[PDB]
Amino acid sequence: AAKATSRKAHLLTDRCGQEAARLPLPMHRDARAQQTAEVVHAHARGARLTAARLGRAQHQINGQ
Amino acid sequence: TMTLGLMRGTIHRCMKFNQEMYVTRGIIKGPLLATRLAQGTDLLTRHNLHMEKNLKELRTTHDNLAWGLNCKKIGHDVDYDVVRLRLRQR
Amino acid sequence: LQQKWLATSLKESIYTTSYPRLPVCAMSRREHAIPVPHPRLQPIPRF
Amino acid sequence: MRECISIHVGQAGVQIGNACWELYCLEHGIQPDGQMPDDSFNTFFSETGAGKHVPRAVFVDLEPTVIDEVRTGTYRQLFHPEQLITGKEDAANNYARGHYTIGKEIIDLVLDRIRKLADQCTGLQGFLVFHSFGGGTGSGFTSLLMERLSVDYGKKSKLEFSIYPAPQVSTAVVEPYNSILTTHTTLEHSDCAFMVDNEAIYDICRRNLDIERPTYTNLNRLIGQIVSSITASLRFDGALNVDLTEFQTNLVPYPRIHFPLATYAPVISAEKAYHEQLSVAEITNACFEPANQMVKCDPRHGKYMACCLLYRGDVVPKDVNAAIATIKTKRTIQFVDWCPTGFKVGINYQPPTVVPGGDLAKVQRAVCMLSNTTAIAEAWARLDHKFDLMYAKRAFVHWYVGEGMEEGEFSEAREDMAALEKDYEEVGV
Amino acid sequence: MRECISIHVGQAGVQIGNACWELYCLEHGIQPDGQMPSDKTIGGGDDSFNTFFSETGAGKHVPRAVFVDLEPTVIDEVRTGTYRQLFHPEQLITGKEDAANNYARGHYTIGKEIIDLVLDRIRKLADQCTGLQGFLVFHSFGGGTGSGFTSLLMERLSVDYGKKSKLEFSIYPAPQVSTAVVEPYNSILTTHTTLEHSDCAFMVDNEAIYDICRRNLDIERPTYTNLNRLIGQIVSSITASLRFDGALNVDLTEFQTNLVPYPRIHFPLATYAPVISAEKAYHEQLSVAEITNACFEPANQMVKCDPRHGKYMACCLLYRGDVVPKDVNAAIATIKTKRTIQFVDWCPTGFKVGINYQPPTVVPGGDLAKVQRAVCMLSNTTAIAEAWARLDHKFDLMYAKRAFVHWYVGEGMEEGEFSEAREDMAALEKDYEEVGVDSV
Amino acid sequence: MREIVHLQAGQCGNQIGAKFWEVISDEHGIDPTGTYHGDSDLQLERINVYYNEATGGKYVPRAVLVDLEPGTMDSVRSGPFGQIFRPDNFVFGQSGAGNNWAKGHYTEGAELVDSVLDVVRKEAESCDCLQGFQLTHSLGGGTGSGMGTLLISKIREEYPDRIMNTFSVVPSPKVSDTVVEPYNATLSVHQLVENTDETYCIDNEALYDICFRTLKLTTPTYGDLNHLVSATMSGVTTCLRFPGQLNADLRKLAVNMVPFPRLHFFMPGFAPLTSRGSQQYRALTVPELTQQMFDAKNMMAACDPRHGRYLTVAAVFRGRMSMKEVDEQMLNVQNKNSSYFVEWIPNNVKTAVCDIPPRGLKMSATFIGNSTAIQELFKRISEQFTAMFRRKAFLHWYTGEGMDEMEFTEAESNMNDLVSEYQQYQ
């Protein structure tokens, strides 16, 4: 009766307990910034190749 | 006794669980001090909300539990004294 | 052995006996300390 | 602007915070009233428009009869009334008492008073935390403080200096369960972490000094003589300086390995040091011999993998470097292969200050080495060996469960130790 | 020229007019006979007393006060006290029987014969003053005179003067310990008259002022008279800018301009910062940063609500003593940085400062310490919809079984107010969250 | 701040509660008019654990002293120390039980508990943060053995977190005072295991086998025997009342002495016990307070643990030395008698240090020993309760008082198994 009601209530409580990624991890600003600065160094080396070709052209033009 | 053991298991589980849930809200605040983090923290919100609903429920339930418990001990000792006095009459 | 043999501190907490007030002259002189007459380098720009 | 706000927790907090804060009153020029009868006090003391110097300290206990004595005796008007925090009942050799139930109404008054000192300090270098694993407040509340210290300050410097239990004797019984389960919280919540053991100061004080039959006060003075050399460079001038950021930089190669040791070199009596030369070679020999350490475990089984040296007084850089080049070469001492150089030196001009009523003499040279090694894998081995000897019969566990706690912390705090017991030979190899 | 005419209603009003007017006789050097010995004052312009006192034909200064009660036994202490010659005899009004914790008695039946005699004396102190800034009201929600008659006096202060300023600094009931039973029927039913017929309105709960004098001051076992002092320190700091010279003055119109954005929204929170004792004044310096941060501390408020649950809409800082505009603006920049204090999304600047040079005055037999500096702050918040909600909690709980309502009907009160003037409060319970909800 | 509210019961309860409050009164300097004429001010700091406050400098104890006939409290009101207790705090009946459980458990006890349960709620509620209660009765009467077990069972239901200790008096096993004293004892013990936090065990030939042999006496009164069980009784609450380096209280000892709530059966002792003519001939040093405790003579139970295992072992020290030379004896005793401890604990000896000695004395120590030497104590009740109950002896004193024979039968099975629960750890 009332005992059975309390039993089913505790059963629902245990259900909620078992029910307990969508959350921000405790630490992660680190990883995010890491990936971002890696993309940064990537585009950096891209521009680097570009300007190194630029300066080879520059030394050629200085010879000209 | 059986209902009391039930209450015990339930309450202790609940304690450890919401302790770890506050621990999780704490991890939140820590990482905090981006918009996806905000969404995760709103998730924390709804979660701990259902959590406190559960807490209030458990409180009231074990309250009713101990109430019926007192009622039981009352009737029992009443009839026990009744038996003893019947024996006295004998 | 006579000062050990022959004897109001029976009632004494160790914090009272082991930590008394030291003399006024045993205080350390700070010989090697950066002088404070010229104020130290501090970011007095409060930003 | 060089502040170091101290945290001391317990009956190891206040019996040590009495001795540590007695040295600084005579290291600088401080009357026990608080006044004075050239600015090194700004790390620890703070000013007012009356010349008073109030320390930047907190003393935390759950027992009034430890801190109702410091506010009774000699150094009484020195401490602010609110800087010393007291409970009303003690957590009584337990974890959950200290961690969940009783620790939750003293977690709030402290964090108001940590915030009031930290708002006063401009250039606050970082907090210092001294406590003991052997009690309720020192091991339950202290790990609760550092679980709520990392959210308020993040990467702010928090150093540990704990009183680990001794491997042969111990004061209690259930004391491993507090000592095991503190490390599950103080791994993610500790920057650097020293260790001492009181039997490894009992034998030193009777051998290396003539004073046998001591108290903890004659053990408290040498603990307070480590801490002066830790903050040595921040107040007095140096040929080379160190700082609070420097120790964890050169002694913590990995963030699950933050366990140095501590050793103080010239521990010789007020008479026996007065009749013998004490050169810089003759103090760096003491810190490497295995009978002088502040722990009871020999590094002959272990490998030194980072080091740090501190120096005081009458030191010349030539003789420092002449005796370093010997102890590199001797094969009683070996290093791991992956630390190529393995040292850090720091020189402070000011010689250390004699305490009236102590057991050390006027000296000119000193060394406070902090050498982490692999010979702490024989420290967690003994704190495990007597924990699964006694968890097999569930010998005390009912004290902990019904105190705002669940059972599952025990079965993971040992499995946390299993990973960190496996960590110390992968790095060790 | 810059007058302010106080009106104190009830036993709470009279016992506050015994602590407010003891402060103003040491602030300007008035002996309790009325005489002022020295014509010069130490920080003001030799006529600083005109906002409160007025010259007469004996060289005697008489206040601009009217004290009201429906009972003689609390004003006849004033008439035989130490200050019995300071007050004009018709500025202390008494009836013959009290309204006795009731609304209809003091509003409709008993309040009708003291509504006429008071308005003869209000129009005499308001015809002497050529420059009246506005009245002040010191009443109590849970009485019969401070609720029935004050709502009768507000309602007739509206038409006799129009859009003149009137402020009330009232005593709302405590959430836990109220001294009465039928206080919530009176407390709800006067919340209409503080919304229509009021221009600004503060609330003090004596349970909240008990929490300060026990904790910050070291008076275990305080009384009402260690609470009437701290309400005089709020009132004096509000009107200190009128009387004594300063760098930035703030009048009573620069209050209402800056912290009242909408005319249904005029309920801010009074807080006074350096409340410390002279054994704890010896220890801590009392700089501008240490006195502008303590107002934001929720343990120091003078009402039982926490503004971490609310959005700060506007603020009003008032600085007394040894403050420079350099350091007032220096510590305002710090509280913007912290994320514990949150402003609403439509108030980007959100402040107002007032600097008065005169340090606050200590009283003999008093309790505080003589300090260089001080702060009074009045911030209004969406953290008032929890104070109102702990009195619908206990009006409907009692009115569901129609308990005490026979007392009210037979004294002249129609049954409409027991269903209307809580739903009158339902809208202002609902306004305050909508005016603090984020933009779309 | 912390308080101890004190319960006594009977003739055992009042001839022990007359001498325990004599040693405490000498400790804090209390004369029999209430006032304070002591020397220092460590003697007035934590006095509120035991004494209340009144007009002037009067300090009247927190004492509940109960019997069922006032021929025991007529004496304790009329001793030297009889004007120190408040007169309301004695509770007396009219017709006592007198060596029968049931008479003072249902008939006369249970109608008297409704005024003792008012004198405890008037007096536990005066205290700010009460630590708990103590009881000291005997299991061989009808006043404390029946009704004192009925206040244990009916104060743990109103305040179920505050502490409950018992300086019980279990039967003397060899020469006994009463025939039917097994029946009073064995029905209390089942009533004792579920509603008591920690239990001492105080026997009276355990006191006789000390004072005969250790203090060399030939006129040992109970007024001598009540010193030996009030020297310990104030030797457990020392660090509440006096500071030290390392402290304890009643809560922290049972934390390290109750592995499981069926296991709280101690046996106490006391270090500095010598004669008056053997007094000056011994130096009062540290190893000579711990060579005496582990010996088989000092204990206050009449049970020898050479057959058993010291499960856990406590200690509480006095005098301004327990710091390094106690830590080479507690290390020595854990190694030399190496077969008297069980394997499954790291270490067993707990430690506290109070720095203030007992008056007229320099140093001391006190023992609280949780053992598997109490399962040979409860077997000599149930080898004489089964040598009585098969022939249904004296049973008409019990079935006509409202009990029944299954209640007698149940206290067999729930004490035969508690020996069979203790018996594995040997």
Curated annotation (Swiss-Prot), chain A:
- State where the protein is found: Cytoplasm, Cytoskeleton, Flagellum axoneme
Q: Which domain of life is it from?
A: Eukaryota
What do we know about how this protein assembles, alone or with others?
Answer: Microtubule inner protein component of sperm flagellar doublet microtubules.
Function statement: Microtubule inner protein (MIP) part of the dynein-decorated doublet microtubules (DMTs) in sperm flagellar axoneme, which is required for motile flagellum beating. Forms an extensive interaction network cross-linking the lumen of axonemal doublet microtubules.
Q: What name does this protein carry?
A: Tektin-like protein 1
Per the UniProt record, the source organism is Mus musculus
Swiss-Prot record, chain C:
Mind telling me what this protein is named?
Cilia- and flagella-associated protein 107
Q: Which residues form the signal peptide?
A: none
Q: Which domain of life is it from?
A: Eukaryota
The subunit field of the Swiss-Prot or TrEMBL record says:
Microtubule inner protein component of sperm flagellar doublet microtubules.
Can you say where in the cell this protein is located? Answer: Cytoplasm, Cytoskeleton, Cilium axoneme; Cytoplasm, Cytoskeleton, Flagellum axoneme
Q: Which gene is the coding source of this polypeptide chain?
A: Cfap107
Which purpose does this protein serve, as stated in its record? Microtubule inner protein (MIP) part of the dynein-decorated doublet microtubules (DMTs) in cilia axoneme, which is required for motile cilia beating.
Q: What is the lineage of its organism?
A: Eukaryota, Metazoa, Chordata, Craniata, Vertebrata
From Swiss-Prot, chain E:
Enzyme Commission identifier(s): 3.6.5.-
Under PROSITE patterns, the record lists: TUBULIN
Which cofactors does it use? Mg(2+)
Q: Which residues carry this modification: N6-acetyllysine?
A: 40
As stated in the Swiss-Prot or TrEMBL entry, residues carrying the post-translational modification Phosphoserine are 439
Which reaction(s) does its UniProt entry say it catalyses?
Answer: GTP + H2O = GDP + phosphate + H(+)
- Binding residue positions for Mg(2+): 71
Q: GTP-binding: is it a keyword of this entry?
A: yes
Entry keyword Metal-binding = yes
Of the GO CC terms on this record, one is: recycling endosome
Q: Where are the transmembrane segments?
A: none
Pfam families associated with the record: Tubulin (PF00091), Tubulin_C (PF03953)
Active-site residues are: 254
- Disulfide pairs here are none
Task: Relate the protein's function as given in its record.
Answer: Tubulin is the major constituent of microtubules, protein filaments consisting of alpha- and beta-tubulin heterodimers. Microtubules grow by the addition of GTP-tubulin dimers to the microtubule end, where a stabilizing cap forms. Below the cap, tubulin dimers are in GDP-bound state, owing to GTPase activity of alpha-tubulin.
Q: Which PANTHER family match?
A: TUBULIN
UniProt lists the family membership as follows: Belongs to the tubulin family.
Entry protein name = Tubulin alpha-1A chain
- Specify the species: Mus musculus (Mouse)
What is the gene name? Tuba1a
UniProtKB/Swiss-Prot annotation, chain F:
| Residues modified as Phosphothreonine | 55
Family annotation (PROSITE patterns): TUBULIN, TUBULIN_B_AUTOREG
Cited SMART domains? Tubulin, Tubulin_C
Superkingdom? Eukaryota
Question: Where in the cell is the protein located?
Answer: Cytoplasm, Cytoskeleton; Cytoplasm, Cytoskeleton, Flagellum axoneme
Which tissues carry this protein? Widely expressed. Expressed in the retina and the cochlea.
The residues the record assigns to binding Mg(2+) are 69
User: What are the record keywords, sorted?
Assistant: Acetylation, Cell projection, Cilium, Cytoplasm, Cytoskeleton, Flagellum, GTP-binding, Isopeptide bond, Magnesium, Metal-binding, Microtubule, Nucleotide-binding, Phosphoprotein
Q: Name one GO biological process term.
A: microtubule-based process
Query: One Pfam annotation, family name?
Result: Tubulin
Give cofactor(s), names only.
Mg(2+)
Q: What SUPFAM superfamilies does this protein map onto? A: Tubulin C-terminal domain-like, Tubulin nucleotide-binding domain-like
Q: Which InterPro entries match?
A: Beta-tubulin_BS, Beta_tubulin, Tub_FtsZ_C, Tubulin, Tubulin/FtsZ-like_C, Tubulin/FtsZ_2-layer-sand-dom, Tubulin/FtsZ_GTPase_sf, Tubulin_C
Known Gene3D superfamilies for this protein? Helix hairpin bin, Tubulin/FtsZ, C-terminal domain, Tubulin/FtsZ, GTPase domain
- Sites bearing N6-acetyllysine, chain numbering: 58
Molecular function terms, GO-annotated: double-stranded RNA binding; GTP binding; GTPase activity; metal ion binding; structural constituent of cytoskeleton
Residues reported to bind GTP: 11, 69, 138, 142-144, 204, 226
In the UniProt record, does the keyword GTP-binding occur?
A: yes
Function of this protein?
Tubulin is the major constituent of microtubules, a cylinder consisting of laterally associated linear protofilaments composed of alpha- and beta-tubulin heterodimers. Microtubules grow by the addition of GTP-tubulin dimers to the microtubule end, where a stabilizing cap forms. Below the cap, tubulin dimers are in GDP-bound state, owing to GTPase activity of alpha-tubulin.
To which protein family does this belong? Answer: Belongs to the tubulin family.
Q: Which gene encodes it?
A: Tubb4b
